[PDB]
Amino acid sequence: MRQCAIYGKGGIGKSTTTQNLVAALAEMGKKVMIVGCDPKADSTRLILNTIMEMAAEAGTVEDLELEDVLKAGYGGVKCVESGGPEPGVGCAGRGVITAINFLEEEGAYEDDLDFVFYDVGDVVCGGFAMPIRENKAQEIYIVCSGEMMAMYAANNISKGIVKYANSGSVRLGGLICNSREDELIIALANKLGTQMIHFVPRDNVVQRAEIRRMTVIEYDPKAKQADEYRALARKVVDNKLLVIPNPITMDELEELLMEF
Amino acid sequence: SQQVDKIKASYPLFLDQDYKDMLAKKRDGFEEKYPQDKIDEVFQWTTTKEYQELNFQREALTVNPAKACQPLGAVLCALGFEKTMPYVHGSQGCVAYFRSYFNRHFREPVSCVSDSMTEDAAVFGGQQNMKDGLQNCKATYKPDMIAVSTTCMAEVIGDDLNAFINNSKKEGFIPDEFPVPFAHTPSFVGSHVTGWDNMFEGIARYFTLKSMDDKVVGSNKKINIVPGFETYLGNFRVIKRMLSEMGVGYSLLSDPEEVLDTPADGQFRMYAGGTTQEEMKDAPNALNTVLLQPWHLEKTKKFVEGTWKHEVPKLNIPMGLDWTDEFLMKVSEISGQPIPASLTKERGRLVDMMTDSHTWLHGKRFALWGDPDFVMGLVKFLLELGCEPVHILCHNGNKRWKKAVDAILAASPYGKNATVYIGKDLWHLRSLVFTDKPDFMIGNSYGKFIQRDTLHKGKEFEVPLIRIGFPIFDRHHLHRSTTLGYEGAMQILTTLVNSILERLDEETRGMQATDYNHDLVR
Amino acid sequence: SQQVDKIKASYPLFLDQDYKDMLAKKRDGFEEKYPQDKIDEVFQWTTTKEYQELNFQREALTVNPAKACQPLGAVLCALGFEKTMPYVHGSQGCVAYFRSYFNRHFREPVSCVSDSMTEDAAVFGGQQNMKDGLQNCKATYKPDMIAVSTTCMAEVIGDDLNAFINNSKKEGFIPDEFPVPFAHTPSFVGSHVTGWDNMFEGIARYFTLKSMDDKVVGSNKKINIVPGFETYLGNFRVIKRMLSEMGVGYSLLSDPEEVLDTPADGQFRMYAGGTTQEEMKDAPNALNTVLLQPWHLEKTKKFVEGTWKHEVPKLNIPMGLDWTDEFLMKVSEISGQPIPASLTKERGRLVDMMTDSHTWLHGKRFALWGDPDFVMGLVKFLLELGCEPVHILCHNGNKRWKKAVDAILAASPYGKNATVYIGKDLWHLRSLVFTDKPDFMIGNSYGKFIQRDTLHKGKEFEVPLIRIGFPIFDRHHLHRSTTLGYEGAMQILTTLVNSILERLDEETRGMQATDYNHDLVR
Amino acid sequence: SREEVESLIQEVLEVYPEKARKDRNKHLAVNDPAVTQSKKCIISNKKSQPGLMTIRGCAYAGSKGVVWGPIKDMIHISHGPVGCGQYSRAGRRNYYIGTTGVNAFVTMNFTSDFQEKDIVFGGDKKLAKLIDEVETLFPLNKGISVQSECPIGLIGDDIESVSKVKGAELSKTIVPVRCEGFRGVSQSLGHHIANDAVRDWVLGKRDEDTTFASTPYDVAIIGDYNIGGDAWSSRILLEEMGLRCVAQWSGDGSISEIELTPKVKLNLVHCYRSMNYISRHMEEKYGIPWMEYNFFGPTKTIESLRAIAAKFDESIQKKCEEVIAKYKPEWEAVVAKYRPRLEGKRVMLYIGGLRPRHVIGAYEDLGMEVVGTGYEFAHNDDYDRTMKEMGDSTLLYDDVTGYEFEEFVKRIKPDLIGSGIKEKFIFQKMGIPFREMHSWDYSGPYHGFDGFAIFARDMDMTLNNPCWKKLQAPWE
Ligand code: CFM
Ligand code: CLF
Ligand code: SF4
Ligand SMILES: [Ca+2]
Ligand SMILES: [Ca+2]
């Protein structure tokens, strides 16, 4: 029963890759659960009532039934969305804390799953780090690009890992690159002391499926990009490299970029 | 003016003519006060059934609450452990208030620290505060254990208590083996009782979760007793007494009876007595575990049944005759010890008292409030006495609780004019005692204001307060009473008949008017 | 008229207009009642210092006494022994009254018989009544001992109790070996307390006087404890508790705790517990003997010192802080048992309560009454609390007692406005609280009438009654209280401050008038 | 005692870890009355060291608890979870005359009692709804204040917009106070935020307004919270002196009094710490001068009356001498009775931001000397004023920890201590007479001449009480 957290810059295709990956995973016969914890995106729209909205409606979290929140989708993937305020108000961070707590307390993780995937938003506070506390996610994968602000984000996340790593059992499982950019991200990983678990090529089919509310695996199982996600899935299922990252300086970053 | 040998304090000083006149000039001259006729009109309206519909239609406003926040219960739970300092992670205002609140009720010192999180710690996280705070508290106040709870500010920003404490140990601020159990206690969830449950479970976890492999159920031959949020010292005492009387080996988990009652002998003792660390470590070896206040010990029950593998008995709070009988017989069953002649006789003496006083208690109507277990045991007792608990309010109660208490009310003819209100406050109840007037209210000190309001409407409409619950700030040493067991039931019964008789003597004290019924014997 | 679902008792039925106009027609029509203005004029007068002088100049009339007659104490004394039937030689009216008086105070059955002496027995002596009665009582009620006291009718005619019982045994009415102790208890000598002293000495004599030669002082290694006329069940209980706690071997001579507090379990127990015949017979073998109420245990002391050769300690009643300390150190001295940590901590907790509450107790003035030992110890505790016992009244007190109490008051600044009145009654005291108004009265149920008089004068003149003493007929289960030891001291203190605070809350409950000082925390 | 207090300080500090050791060192000192500048002797108003059992409160306690809360005809809303509101409900004895629940609301607790969903979704819509509910249920209120608790400040709840829209709509003055508990380091910043909220939303309401009939003798009591009736016992003197007291700041204060305050001739400031901000503001905007006064004890009351009357004409000055003479027999009676009972007794004090220096003269009128004094949250300007009022080699302590205070008391051994409820039962246990100098131990007044009588009565009943002679068991 492996719990994994997925962080990365959203303007890339963080949510889309997470879902295509989980779809490939479910396709291999793996029982997966996706937990949406990203206010800046829709984490289950491709696989398919949030915990927070359902709670308010029923009064409180204590009045919530797991069946009201968990819904099965493609490949039998179980989906749960934390929920959160509308834009510019409230506190989405606490919404994540509450949702995860509810899932813990309502025995959602003890059903016999193979994987749990947290699709997390930018760690701007403790609440969005809820997924990487003890007894939660042990494996962290960051989706990145050759863009600067995209690699810098990869580092900030690593610094956040380091912090919770010295305190418990949580490691960086590697980098996933959404399309010499191929080489750049590889060096970024070597610097971090981890790896680039997979280079997801650019392919219009992903958008085609995405705009039609599907992952490539469901949209077109025979597509070449479909096999790319199946390749990522296998590399994740067999991955054994979990590490505590060695963040770099923005200077060291401008050096790496300037070398390409 | 003041005469040196008959000095007046605020009452009756301000009732003197020069002050009364000055106050009148302040009002007419600068206060722009609404005319008394308008003040009188609005008051009468706040008394009507029309105002009551409006009052009960509130969905955003809360006026005069009958509950407090989680951390307060957390501090009390932690005080029940040997040489432990309750530590609240977050801002300090909370702690000053927690301490003050308990000082005023117990009339004793209450020790608790904060790590004083300020505006920059709200923005950066309270990790540094936790490192230095744990180090300073251990070095200065020297406890054997520090029990960490939280204030809302630290809960909003998601300060990971577990990581923060582990990093504190890792960096050398406190020893790796120094006990530091923790519990996230959000103000905005539940109430003070939930804080107790979270903290107790957090300590239970700390001392037993890892060590479960060498534990055998029933091997130490004791029964664990988990008290819950308890502010009556006599309740810790009566349970310990009844079990020792039976020869029942027990372990009371969270016992603040000694710290909250040290002697004024010349020295201040910050710590006194309490459940030892070893009693908590050895707890899974017990025959079973009895939770005295089950309706707010739900997370604890789940850890005890889940991890300790104990079959916690479905037992209600031991208040009143039936539930005390049930408690003793269950304790008898589990331990193998028979209920002794002493307790049997004590039971008959409470029944004796009931047969002596039933005449005055019959059909007496009561408005009452408090925490869910207390208020439920009280309803049951009142019902055994032939009394009608007309208005039952539990601000912090939930839907299942209301069902349970409605079931109890359904089982007796005395609970037929009774309604249970959850999530309602004392301003809601203020209305209830105005529109459907009972004979007395049984609640805490905040109900003295409801009595004041009912008396302003008139002497006939006045509903007297019988001070039972928490907090009692306006009377002294009531925190020494007993509410639990037959002992507690006898105390409660005496207070109720004598409040009834006190009130009757008051209404019959009029010379040649009502004193024809001012009887010597009652 | 009566509404079936809101039935009114005497109060408030007679306040209805049809009864109020009916009552007015009875008064104006056939009562020839003095005009209200003359009734109010004389009331006002009975309030003045002028009326007080006349009142205190009385030498023949006694109005509203604060004492009862000898046999009552004799009946209570006898009830303190195992399976003994109190027997009062004389007129039966006495017994009916003794029983009713004690039933109303303890709310229990009190067993006692008379040999019902009629007019002819008044003329021929009660010798036949003694013969029949001892035979009838022993066979019907089956006691193991019959303790004989007397009514005034039998005392005036000089019925020799000793001869009559000896002739009863000789004629085969009761066996020769059947225990029948006696005591001449004249109603026109002293009071109920003297009757207890007399009855106790009679029982001590019966069992020990002939047996003295084989007795050795201190050989059974116990301390006998003689309680005296005691009507608070918590007092027998606290003394037995503190001695057992110290590990002191003792024997309580006259112990009615069990008969006066039987359980309502399904059966009626006429007898229960008590001091055994053997404890009485073995009594001279004790290390010493401690009299808890020395001022009414003088004859007993003379028999114990003269007869048993015991060196009775010069000890005051153990009420208050100092006299409990003294009692404990004396019992420690005699027994050789150290005063344990539990009692040391209990003393510190009473002192703690005193420091917590001194602010409200200070300078508070009290009028009080009761039996000599009780009122003496009440005065000392009030003094230790910073209060002023302004009017101390003891109807049944003597000159030497007034001396001792004056010595107590002269040793403290709080007794500088105090006066002691012996041989005076409650009509005398009624005047003292009118002319030199104190804050409260501490007395029995008879003071409820003084409270109604002061209130009639007006609210600012009202002196509230705090019910401590005997008899308490208008409240329930107060007979279960404790007046002795630190425990009793804690109960009295709580009752005093809370009475002060209840009264202050009433005075400041006036909306917009006096409620500026109606504080939540006190 | 000159170097015995410095070695004491060092000995006490020995128990702290190094970081806390160096910070507390500069917060403790020995007085030298020649030090007009306290910053080379003691620093203050810095944050509390974590885990050392400080006695301090928060910004909410300063705003809601002390400044806004006393204002009787407004409804003050503790915005956030149920806690703050409950603990501070009627804990401070800020007296008032009014019919509670109808036209006065001081002892009541109005809260938004935040639940998880109000934290996550935000509570501005809930606030708006709550305001409509206090309007139908408490129609006679003359304004509303919104007192922020910690969560409101993190979550970014735009409460001033809610206050603006609801206030304009209902034609009500609704004041938003950003007094969330984590701001600042104590109650002190809460005073400041509250003073600013008063000027920005209430004070200038009657600015272009000339309806009020002014008099050359108009004054305002600023910073007297009427604890036990302290302000009423102060204005009786001021008004007998011929002055007209148009306003009382917060103690029994009304909103109209506050609005009418810019119309006066002089601001008489009692509590310098909590309201010097609004006074200074009234000087630069309305031109109203302000001066500090002390009504604790006869020597100070007399001095104060004379200084205050000297700002006016000869008729007020003449009435000033009339009042001093009127009460002279009375306070001399109190001194004659209680001073012999109290002379030479030593007192250690530790209160808020004004009493630790303000009650000194009153204690000295009874022959008692203050051997130690300190503040929870004062700034250096309060300590500047403290040097003249204290004796020479005395102890001074800012934001004293539970440990420090206990040990200082163990060395010094004062006959009486004056502090709050959180330390009361600690020292009674230790056998030392204690008087609450925040709540007056439910007595009061202590201000003015009639208040002095009660002060002396109280110090005497506690210090010379018979219980203190019985702490030790005769058998040990
Ligand atoms: S602890 Fe006053 S600066 Fe402030 S509530 Fe008490 S020493 Fe305050 S005088 Fe005052 S009425 Fe006060 S006593 Fe200034 S208002 S934050 Mo706690
Ligand atoms: S500094 Fe949240 S509910 Fe109110 S007591 Fe707190 S845990 Fe409880 Fe000051 S603003 Fe309030 S008392 Fe901020 S939270 Fe403490
Ligand atoms: S940064 Fe995080 S903890 Fe702070 S208000 Fe926003 S979502 Fe909540
Ligand atoms: Ca105490
Ligand atoms: Ca009975």
Side-chain angles (χ1 to χ4, degrees), chain A residues 90-94 124-128, chain B residues 156-158, chain D residues 154-156:
Chain A
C91 170
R94 181 65 200 191
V124 293
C125 55
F128 290 111
Chain B
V156 161
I157 69 174
Chain D
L154 305 160
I155 247 84

Side-chain angles (χ1 to χ4, degrees), chain B residues 237-282:
Chain B
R237 293 170 181 150
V238 73
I239 294 294
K240 288 194 285 182
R241 190 263 292 184
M242 295 175 98
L243 295 176
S244 292
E245 193 157 32
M246 285 186 65
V248 177
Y250 68 88
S251 197
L252 183 64
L253 318 177
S254 182
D255 180 17
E257 195 246 277
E258 298 292 318
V259 234
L260 260 33
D261 204 34
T262 55
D265 66 332
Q267 68 167 88
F268 164 57
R269 297 165 179 80
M270 181 164 279
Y271 313 114
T275 301
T276 68
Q277 289 192 31
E278 296 294 300
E279 283 185 293
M280 253 276 112
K281 287 179 178 182
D282 190 46

Side-chain angles (χ1 to χ4, degrees), chain C residues 347 352 358 512 517 519, chain D residues 93 95 99 429 462 470 472:
Chain C
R347 185 192 122 85
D352 179 75
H358 82 281
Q512 199 173 247
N517 185 45
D519 312 339
Chain D
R93 304 200 299 143
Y95 285 17
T99 307
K429 249 64 155 82
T462 294
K470 279 72 207 290
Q472 189 171 285

Side-chain angles (χ1 to χ4, degrees), chain D residues 113-132:
Chain D
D113 182 28
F114 267 34
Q115 304 272 66
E116 265 196 300
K117 71 174 171 192
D118 303 310
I119 293 291
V120 182
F121 295 106
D124 285 328
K125 282 179 172 175
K126 188 173 186 177
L127 215 215
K129 228 288 181 165
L130 180 155
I131 291 173
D132 288 341

Side-chain angles (χ1 to χ4, degrees), chain D residues 66 92 191 225 227 271 273-274 351-355 377 438:
Chain D
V66 323
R92 208 171 75 137
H191 295 154
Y225 298 94
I227 302 304
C271 179
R273 169 47 44 209
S274 54
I351 325 167
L354 185 69
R355 328 203 134 152
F377 53 80
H438 284 249

Side-chain angles (χ1 to χ4, degrees), chain C residues 32 61 89 106 365 371 488 519:
Chain C
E32 290 179 57
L61 171 74
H89 177 89
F106 298 104
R365 329 197 325 137
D371 283 345
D519 312 339

